[PDB]
């Protein structure tokens, strides 16, 4: 379910999905599904989310466990795997951020 | 008064590479620059426009930025499907006024 | 503050409820609000296209030298924060310093590294960590620089403010590729670096308009600067930057700054010079650092700080450890300054570096002038007469002279006789060959022009014509750079500037014409003033038998440094001549005199302070007393206050 | 006589002052762990209207251009101005850089007779706080980003816009 | 948001593809200029100097033409050649002058 245009603190979200470019419509998007019970399925941005997670993991590497270490290594080269200098689809209008 | 002059290009620019064409002449004072591309036998399309301090935004990925005296435009793709004559235009904001020819054959 | 079950394709859970305690200071809530995960992709493409991107990461496969020596002999461990009176014995006891407390002392002040300004908000996150900076401003705050550092990477900023209030910002982050800050969004390091060695990188962060604005006048050589940074050691780097800055200090370089490539580079170097020592200390990793290397590096850093503060108005925060200063003071306090001359060259240089490091401030302790003077006196005693300074002795004197210069640039001082002795010894060491060698070094830019025992000399007669008359006879140098060398020598010897005058010298108020003197000879119990005018107050007056078409070359023997109430009127006396002189003199005679040789037309030629029987033997045995030429006369300025001339030997 | 004399020795010096192994880490250092990077902001000059001001009454008829003493909103080509000497208005009782200040209705009249004077300087400024009120108030509307205290109009321009630079040779009408 | 334009009055020619225009998307800015391009040249301007809205307005730089209607939402710009004579028969385009993402269609011809 690729989202084109749709426009939440960490307290009110408890689930998040990430998909590859091939699985999506050539994009890298995430759906921050809040805790049926799924109140919202807002289409977030995969690039910003993965970058924030990578930065958090790198800053917390002082006390990172083994599972989190391999998670960080997996998110690495997955950011680079996308390598999205540009991507076409979901053309619409916008005003500001 | 203000005129725009581009450098003629005859090389096919191979197939996969970037291009950079300079449009500049005399010294602009209060006129921005706009880019127009037209395939042979088609309506020109507006590319990114540079006001010598900022670049406009078009869905095509054609990054074109100017300098203190000259202007440059990059496409990062020279496929034969993009073998079109590019145009640089002189305009304050709205009224494109002056343009000069070019040649961007791609093969 | 909650737990997120991350899904991707497996499953991951991030326990923020416990990760907060393990890592203090983390702010997951703020970082998300900075990330703005709800942004249209068109906004991503707009923001990402703003930043200037540079391709062609060349200049690879550089050479990495070794800097920190391994632990040697049985040196113990000295905690950088637990310096106690009983630790070690002296200069002959090897010692080592720990690296973790030293790093903690060097990087003590915390602050915000990456600001919230527009260029740095798009690319980087917000950073807060222990740091140090080297900030300076020129052109009435129209140009600013901030060289904030860390034990992992550097970050410069050439924030220039033009009219209308608009600014222009640059960034030259440097450091290991695995320790660089964190990006965000579609940004990646390999599209930003302009150079990369095996394990180092030099990225540049700016917008296209700002990059073009800085490209209007400032063009870099990032490959060259990166190669210099990687290839050189900390001490050698620091010495090279100090030499360049000292050379720029003369010729009116730092009097006013200019907006060109050289100045901004030099700022970046200075930043890299500090960061190299910081990283080298940090890179040890809970090991140990040899004391000699620390002393050398911190002495170079102190001299660099002094020169940048003198000619730039720069401000340095951090990069100083009080434990090392305490250790240096404790080590130097054991030795006696008056016996520093009877030591090995390496030990002398080590002691001088320790003394300079331990007392960075001026006027806290003036007893180091005695040690410097003793070292200079021993070198002069063992130096062959009328010969250019050897490179080893030149570097030893350069190391020593910092304390003397620092005391000289004061306003009131106590070490009067020691300063007078040092200046007299420096005057005796500035002969024709030495001046020619220094001119050649200045023309070629080598180490010869960096320091010489002439800048602190009391010879005020060195004019541009005289210096040009004695250009080096080695292919005439470049035959065009001689003028530049002479101009630099004159700038370094400017009387009005450089704070090189005789305010500290007693019996200086009795001249009344500061520009008409030739040289001042501060002997014991009497000082001689040589000038071409009679308007000088002293105990007596002596007129040399010079030719009419030349300067008078008066001599005024001020006795006991008690200036007279007025100039001695009447006809000046005539110097007596001794017809008989047996050049054997087994007994130690003239031990305290100062023989002077002058030309009838050229003027003053050479001076020799007789300090021991060896100097007298060298004077008598050699061909110094050449009476064949009827244009050279030798004056024996006795310490009794009378001038006696030598006619001829047997 | 030439009595033998002793050698030359350095003058005695005092022992170094004792050092104290009691200063605290905060006392020896900047006494505060938290700091902030040093900023050195500067200041710049402003625009102040002095001397020349609005005249008394009027002696004109209507919007027209003449090279004489008649004409409400028109003047000859100064050919030498940089928005600073333009404010001098070296003319017989010019109430502005022109004879009359710019207006949101007079603009088409001057725009029509603008043959090859594409660039000209309109006598409208600011005081560093917006609210452009040249010589009559009313807060004349002006949209611009590039430019601080200069204004200019062209044939294809209706609302006054700011010139990004002031030193440029801007002829005054 | 969408604008239609294109007209011609004169004695000669056939005027193949004489009515066509389009708009939509990006950011909308007023006025609709008209550009006349002879073969072998880049662009010359007819009376499109001062248009009022998406349906343009009359103007004249160095030539005599005509324009009618003014509306920035639908409008009908049209045009009227001043009794076209020898030469001056070449393709003439039109623009929405929308600045950001300006639209430019293909229309008009000669012979």
Swiss-Prot record, chain D:
Virion surface face of the membrane: 1-173
GO molecular function terms attached to this record: carbohydrate binding
Disulfide-bonded cysteines: 57-96, 60-73, 86-172, 150-166
Residue intervals of the C-type lectin domain: 69-173
Coverage span on the entire protein: 43 to 215 of 223
Family: Belongs to the epstein barr virus gp42 family.
Principal cellular location given in the protein's record: virion
GO cellular component entries: membrane; virion membrane
Assigned keywords, A-Z: Disulfide bond, Host-virus interaction, Lectin, Membrane, Transmembrane, Transmembrane helix, Virion
Subunit structure: Forms a complex with gp25 and gp85 via its N-terminus; this complex is used for invasion of B-lymphocytes.
Keyword tRNA processing listed: no
Keyword Membrane recorded: yes
Described purpose of this protein according to its UniProt entry: Plays a role in virion attachment to host B-lymphocytes, through binding to leukocyte antigen (HLA) class II and subsequently participates in fusion of the virion with host membranes. May act as a tropism switch that directs fusion with B-lymphocytes and inhibits fusion with epithelial cells.
Name this polypeptide is given: Glycoprotein 42
Intracellular or extracellular location(s): Virion membrane
Domain characteristics, as noted in the entry: The C-lectin type domain is essential for virion-induced membrane fusion.
């Amino acid at each position: 379910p690729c989202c084109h245009v749709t426009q939440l603190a960490l307290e009110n979200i408890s689930d998040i999905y990430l998909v590859s470019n091939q699985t999506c419509d050539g994009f890298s998007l995430a759906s921050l599904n809040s805790p049926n019970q799924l109140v919202i399925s807002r289409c977030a941005n995969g690039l910003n989310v993965v970058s924030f997670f990578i930065s958090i993991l790198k800053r917390s590497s002082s006390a990172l466990t083994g599972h989190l270490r391999e998670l960080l290594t997996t998110l690495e080269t997955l950011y680079g795997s996308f390598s999205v200098e540009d991507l076409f689809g979901a053309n619409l209008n916008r005003y500001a951020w | 008064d203000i005129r725009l002059t581009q450098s003629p290009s005859s090389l096919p620019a191979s197939v996969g590479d970037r291009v950079t064409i300079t449009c500049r002449a005399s010294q602009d004072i209060a006129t921005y620059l706009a880019w127009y591309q037209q395939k042979p036998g088609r309506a020109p399309n507006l590319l990114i426009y540079a006001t010598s301090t900022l670049q406009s935004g078009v869905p095509p990925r054609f990054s074109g930025s100017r300098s203190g005296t000259d202007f440059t435009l990059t496409i990062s793709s020279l496929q034969p499907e993009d073998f079109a004559t590019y145009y640089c235009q002189q305009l304050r904001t709205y009224p494109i006024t002056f343009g000069q020819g070019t040649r961007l054959e791609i093969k | 503050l909650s737990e997120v079950k991350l899904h991707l394709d497996s499953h991951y859970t991030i326990p923020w409820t416990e990760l907060m305690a393990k890592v203090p200071g983390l702010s997951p809530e703020a970082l998300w609000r900075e990330a703005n995960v709800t942004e249209d992709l068109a906004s991503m493409l707009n923001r990402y296209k703003l930043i200037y991107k540079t391709s062609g990461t060349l200049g690879i496969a550089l050479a990495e030298p070794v800097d920190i020596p391994a632990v040697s002999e049985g040196s113990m461990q000295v905690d950088a924060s637990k310096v106690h009176p009983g630790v070690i014995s002296g200069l002959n006891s090897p010692a080592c310093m720990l690296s973790a407390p030293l790093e903690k002392q060097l990087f003590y002040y915390i602050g915000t590294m990456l600001p919230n300004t527009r260029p740095h908000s798009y690319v980087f996150y917000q950073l807060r960590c222990h740091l140090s900076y080297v900030a300076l401003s020129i052109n009435g705050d129209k140009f600013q620089y901030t060289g904030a550092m860390t034990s992992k990477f550097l970050m410069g900023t050439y924030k220039r403010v033009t009219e209308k209030g608009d600014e222009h910002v640059l960034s030259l982050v440097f450091g290991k590729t695995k320790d660089l800050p964190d990006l965000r969004g579609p940004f990646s390091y390999p599209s930003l670096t302009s150079a990369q060695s095996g394990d180092y990188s030099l990225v540049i962060v700016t917008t296209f308009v700002h990059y073009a604005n800085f490209h209007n006048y400032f063009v870099p050589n990032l490959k060259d600067m990166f190669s210099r940074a990687v290839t050189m050691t900390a001490a050698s780097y620091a010495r090279y930057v100090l030499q360049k800055l000292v050379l720029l200090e003369m010729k009116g370089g730092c009097r006013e700054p200019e907006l060109d490539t050289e100045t901004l580079t030099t700022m970046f170097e200075v930043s890299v010079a500090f960061f190299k020592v910081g990283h080298a200390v940090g890179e040890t990793g809970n090991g140990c650092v040899d004391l000699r290397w620390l002393a050398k590096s911190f002495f170079e850093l102190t001299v660099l700080k002094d020169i940048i503060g003198i000619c730039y108005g720069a401000t340095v925060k951090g990069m100083q450890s009080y434990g090392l200063e305490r250790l240096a003071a404790m080590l130097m306090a054991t030795v006696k300054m008056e016996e520093l001359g009877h030591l090995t060259t390496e030990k002398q240089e080590y002691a001088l570096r320790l003394a300079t490091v331990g007392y960075p401030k001026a006027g806290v302790y003036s007893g180091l002038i005695g040690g410097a003077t003793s070292v200079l006196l021993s070198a002069y005693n063992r130096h062959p007469l009328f010969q250019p300074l050897h490179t080893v002795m030149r570097e030893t004197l350069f190391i020593g002279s910092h304390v003397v210069l620092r005391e000289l640039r004061l306003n009131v001082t106590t070490q009067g006789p020691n300063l007078a002795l040092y200046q007299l010894l420096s005057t005796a060491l500035c002969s024709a060959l030495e001046i020619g060698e220094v001119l050649r070094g200045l023309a070629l830019g080598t180490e010869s022009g960096l320091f010489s025992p002439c800048y602190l000399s009391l010879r005020f007669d060195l004019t541009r014509d005289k210096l040009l008359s004695m250009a080096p006879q080695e292919a005439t140098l470049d035959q065009a750079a001689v003028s530049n060398a002479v101009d630099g020598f004159l700038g370094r010897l400017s009387l009005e500037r450089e704070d090189r005058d005789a305010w500290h010298l007693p019996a200086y108020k009795c001249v009344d014409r500061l520009d008409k003197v030739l040289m001042i000879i501060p002997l014991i119990n009497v000082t001689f003033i040589i000038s071409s005018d009679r308007e000088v107050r002293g105990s007596a007056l002596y007129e040399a038998s010079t030719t009419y078409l030349s300067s008078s070359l008066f001599l005024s023997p001020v006795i006991m440094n008690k200036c007279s109430q007025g100039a001695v009127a009447g006809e000046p006396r005539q110097i007596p001549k001794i017809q008989n002189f047996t050049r054997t003199q087994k007994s130690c005679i003239f031990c305290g005199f100062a023989l002077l040789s002058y030309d009838e037309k050229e003027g003053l030629e050479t001076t020799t302070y007789i300090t021991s029987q060896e100097v007298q033997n060298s004077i008598l045995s050699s061909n110094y007393f050449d009476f064949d030429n009827l244009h050279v006369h030798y004056l024996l300025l006795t310490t009794n206050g009378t001038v006696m001339e030598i006619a001829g030997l047997y | 006589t030439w009595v033998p004399k002793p050698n030359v020795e350095v003058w005695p010096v005092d022992p170094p002052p004792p050092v104290n192994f009691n200063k605290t880490a905060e006392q020896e250092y900047g006494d505060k762990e938290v700091k902030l990077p040093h900023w050195t902001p500067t200041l710049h000059t402003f625009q102040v209207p002095q001397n020349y001001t609005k005249a008394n009454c009027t002696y004109c008829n209507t919007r027209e251009y003449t090279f004489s003493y008649k004409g409400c909103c028109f003047y000859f080509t100064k050919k030498k101005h940089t928005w600073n000497g333009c404010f001098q208005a070296c003319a017989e009782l010019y109430p502005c850089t022109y004879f009359y200040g710019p207006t949101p209705d007079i603009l088409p009249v001057v725009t029509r007779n603008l043959n090859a004077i594409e660039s000209l300087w309109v006598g409208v400024y600011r005081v560093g706080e917006g609210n452009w009120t040249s010589l009559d108030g009313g807060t004349f509307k002006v949209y611009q980003i590039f430019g601080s205290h200069c204004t200019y109009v062209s044939k294809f321009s209706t609302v006054p816009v700011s010139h990004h630079e002031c030193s440029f040779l801007k002829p005054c009408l | 948001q969408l604008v239609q334009s294109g007209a011609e009055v004169k004695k000669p020619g056939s005027s193949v593809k004489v009515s066509c225009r389009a708009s939509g998307g990006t950011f909308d800015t007023y006025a609709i200029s008209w550009v006349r391009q002879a073969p072998g040249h880049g662009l010359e301007w007819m009376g499109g100097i001062i248009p009022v809205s998406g349906t343009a307005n009359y103007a004249q730089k160095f030539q005599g033409r005509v324009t009618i209607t003014a509306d920035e939402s639908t409008g009908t710009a049209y045009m009227d050649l001043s009794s076209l004579r020898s030469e001056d028969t070449a393709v003439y385009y039109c623009a929405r002058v929308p600045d950001y993402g300006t639209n430019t269609p293909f229309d008009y011809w000669g012979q």
